[model samples]
Target: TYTDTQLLIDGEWVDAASGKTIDVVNPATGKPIGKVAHAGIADLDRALAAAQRGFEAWRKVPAHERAATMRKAAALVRERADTIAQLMTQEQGKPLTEARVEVLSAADIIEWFADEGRRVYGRIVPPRNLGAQQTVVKEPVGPVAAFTPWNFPVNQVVRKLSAALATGCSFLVKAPEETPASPAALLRAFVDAGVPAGVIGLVYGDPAEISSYLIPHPVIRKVTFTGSTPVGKQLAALAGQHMKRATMELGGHAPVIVAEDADVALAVKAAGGAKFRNAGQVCISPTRFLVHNSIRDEFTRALVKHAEGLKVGNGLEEGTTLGALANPRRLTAMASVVDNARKVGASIETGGERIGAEGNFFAPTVIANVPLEADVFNNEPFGPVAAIRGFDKLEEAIAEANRLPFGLAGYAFTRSFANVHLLTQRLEVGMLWINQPATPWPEMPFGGVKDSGYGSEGGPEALEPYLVTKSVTVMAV
Candidate 1:
């Protein structure tokens, strides 16, 4: 893997027409690790034109042929997983262990979608007249424009990219400039695996300017985004104005319910891993904990013990369980959020302070007796902090869980089948986990409701936005 990154347009790696570049920072050291090309309007126009031509040519290839090319790319990605993981850790500040899993998982997602395209189906309809017949067909919509987030350089981009390519649509992805190289490496694999020139383009730049330029362009037929709710809404509106098909995977404040019947140890075990993963930057990271009064004290103590046990340090270091925040903005936000919680009478259990002044690092923090006035409870901390309060009744817990506007993902731990059945139906979320945190897989749809987002990211639903249905009828004269 290389330190510097470039813009990939058509089949060529090029610099900005203005020769402007952005310094890529290593969050582990809070220093400049490398540089990446910054795309301008000129570069976006070039990518748009290239993607238009690419879609026309690529869609003509048979589905099996496309799947074959995808398999080759998946193999290449898995083989180079370690190198790509290193780049992700350097830029995104996640533990190397976690980064490796992200890369390997992304490869598997690509491999999964490769097979999905083969299973795609259409239907035949019988007509009343003997000479009449009708059929429905699935066709690739057109070229796509996508924006992926920094929290998940691999997860966010892979779901969208794999869907577009497998469905025979060319893509132009504006991956986060904060973590650029890992995505670049992903594109490199596809290129080396024989992806046609212009079939895929990767660029890094000013997000707003690039988005405005790309989404409104007539060449792009579909638009997809993964980021904050506000930004996703803005992009979605722009796409709507242009009358382009759009899908958005936005922010989340996942609420977790710990019932009286929950295995206290099991609840603690799941919370520690899910909350501190990527230093709690994940979109679906569990944030608010609403526990039954019978076990709230025990659960809180165990959660504190678990949080205090994690080793926080540079991502590349061995035995680092939690790494630095991706940038200084998160560091500032975390501190402010903690201060607000404290002002509102929230209690810090074990860890709550910033580690040092150099790298953007915060200790794994757990806040208890959290009040509704606390900023941590309302806004997304998007860091290694968990807010908790107790509830006496089942309705109380469910109400609290559904209190926030976000409806991304939720967690519940209970042995009672009735509780499971109740939670499975009542929780107002896109996805709910019962007993254990079920990490998202390619076979199931992954998305959110309410302010969290509209549309989905994974499963058979992944290809839905990329393909459009056409009904055909024929009659013999």
Candidate 2:
């Protein structure tokens, strides 16, 4: 097992001021894999002061220099991908292959932001009055307090840090207590690439206390969080109270709508993979399968076949298609959700039980005839469970998909031009896929609407939240 039992603050690795520690468990083995220091109020205060100093220096660096440093960091991450990925798999219970892909993707995000940094363009306005000038420019939002979740641990951390670093902003990250090694590896990579001291900091501890202290701190000018909707809202509210700019990427209960004119076979295959990747632990993982009534039977058959074919086991083992849940609480949550659906007369097409006595394993589950009143209908399962329902009309299907408060992501399958147009216009989500269900690239903006949280995370839009725009005017001189 890999262990990073210290906090990385400024340029030093040290234990928590209180000397408290938390055990890191491997969900695949149901054993303690390692331990990490837990930050407290004093540690947070020190980190905050360090970050402020870091931001002052970082903001003064030339944009081109920042870009060069970020590029080197990205290359360093790619070179160390194998060892870092192995450690992340052991810590997070994701397949070794998946962990590798995530690490590579994070490297790509860093590179993309590195180049994008040079293009934070400013505009010189055409003034209406003679001898008058007006201009608009963008600047970093200063030191940021970031909170990232366990799922896609490396990817989330890199996404936030890459943009912040590229845009000349210093950051203090609160990594997920469940999986610290991934973030620790990322920090090591940046430090190895010769990033300036205090430019980045990593600490993990009580979410409530850390957030409470950081969100209201005068030094924290900006906040970014990736997590569940409830926590996202609370953070957003607290950030609002302090008038600090915030960017949030929260929970998602994505709906996959299969149209009557769609290719049922292809749709099921793609949807099944989307629903089960990372054991369906992804925030944007498709949960609610809304299929047209005309093809419900065929779709359900293919879906069950696809679900049954997935092999679940230890992530490090070869040919294991799925892995265990991150913790015991998820197993309990999955049971409660499945039981609630069954009580309402839903039919379990294939699986709805724990796989074994050890670890946090759950079989990929598929349920049919799930009623609208069932908990699975709207609530995100965040597991390998699919709650499917049939719809008679296109309008009905669209409405049903939008019924949930989450609008992070949604998908539809139809070759018809009219249906495509309607689905694109109607889906209440930040990301919509007509024929594809895979997650987007680093170059595309990622975020959601409604209860899914606000602000974008990638592409050109990502730099906006980290930047503060300024307008300057000069009268006749």
Candidate 3:
């Protein structure tokens, strides 16, 4: 439905030099929606030139002025939320309501970062009554190369760009080919809201090829990315060689622990909606759901019932509560995961079947009695598969939660204040959601630990990293 044929480079939209195009497909109906030019080597150079030029003038603008412009952009996004949301659903196969929420979620972050733009504070210290005083100021680092994933296209790009722009840094974003419409929608909003030329640029291409070129480019002073762990590691290694400041929020096999005293019904209700939404592609999505033996059966039944009722249909249809997989690849991957888990002794509860021959779609799935050593526990399926494991002791539950090498996010539901105390103090992650599934929030700083990657994406920590701190000491006359 949207055939945007140009990439936004510098101040204008232009065709790819190579004229190579990537067809944008709607996963819901297994049909091509539109196509756009894929960036080539020359396109990268154009963006680099514009970003270098833009940085010179844009970074020098006063912080408050920059913040004001971002506020205007945020307001513009809110006013145009429906258009952006609908585009996201059509292109990415997320439920329409979920897509709408995703747009608003991104806009909320933009609005927050707009206020934080002016709040990039520095410290001042008296030099022991000496003639000099020490003052520190945060300055924009420079142009950044940001790479985003398809799972949450608008949110991912907006999170990086909002923080980059608000902190006075220019940026070039490599949006995912799978869902160009969402990011294209975002670019449209920024341009329509009166953003300055080269302040933010878009380059669409094969991520691996384009990122290999951009991340190591000398003009790119910083790198921010959200995607799979293996790719994040490769990018970090490449950025390291260039000595670029890098931020990564990568893959996860998140654990959700249900304590003996927890409300089984509540936990099931929460996990069902959060896990099944977006077909379980999010990095921090709950993959290994740990339930205490005392209430395992009760929780299992409730989860099954909730998942069974979801209406899977075309993403844009009014009554469709769940959508098709983004493509055939995901359908295959999910089937393999389900089959592997079942062979290894995991019980498939509600769904484990592919539906519709025309499109890549899977019914919502729930698993119980899964072994800790199952491949499904460690590897990220990136599809609709939720594995449940049972824990008998509190220590064991905590141990099981932390067993994975990837420590991006983990959650627990417990009525006991003592259990909460221990879990809160002991859980190792960039984020921990108590009585709620750990998910991205606009106002919070988000990232992960271990193999899940490093650096925060939202809040003040995010903006500070896109800036450099210089200590200034001046003598009084």
Per-candidate Cα lDDT values, in order, are 0.90, 0.90, 0.85
Clashing pairs in 1: none
Q: Which residue pairs of candidate 2 clash?
A: none
Q: Which ten residues in a row are the worst by lDDT in model 3?
A: 434-443
TM-score of each prediction = 0.98, 0.98, 0.97
Report RMSD for candidate 3.
1.4
For candidate 1, the 10 contiguous residues with the lowest summed lDDT are: 434-443
Report the C-alpha displacement of residue 474, candidate 2, in angstroms.
1.6
lDDT of 1 by residue, 1-477 (tens): 348999999989889999999999999797898999999998988998999989998999988999999999999999999999999999999999999999999999999999998877899988778798888999999999999999989778888999999899999999999899999999999999999999999998899999988888889999998899999889888988989998878888888889888898988898767999989998889999998889999898889989989998999999999999999999999889888988998999977899988899999999999987788878888999999989898888898888889999999899999999899988999988876765888878999999988887788888999999999888989
Candidate 2 C-alpha lDDT tens digits along 254-351: 99999999998789878888888999999889888898889999999999999999899999999988988988989999999999998999999998
- Write one digit per residue (lDDT tens) for candidate 3, span 256-312: 889999988779877777888788888878888889998988888888888888898
TM-score of 2: 0.98
Per-residue lDDT for 154 in model 2?
90
How well does candidate 1 score on lDDT at residue 164? 95
In the order shown, the candidates' Cα RMSDs to the true structure are 1.0, 1.0, 1.4
Clashes of each: 0, 0, 0
- For TM-score, candidate 1 versus 3, the one ahead is 1
The true-versus-predicted C-alpha distance at residue 424 of model 3, in Å, is 0.8
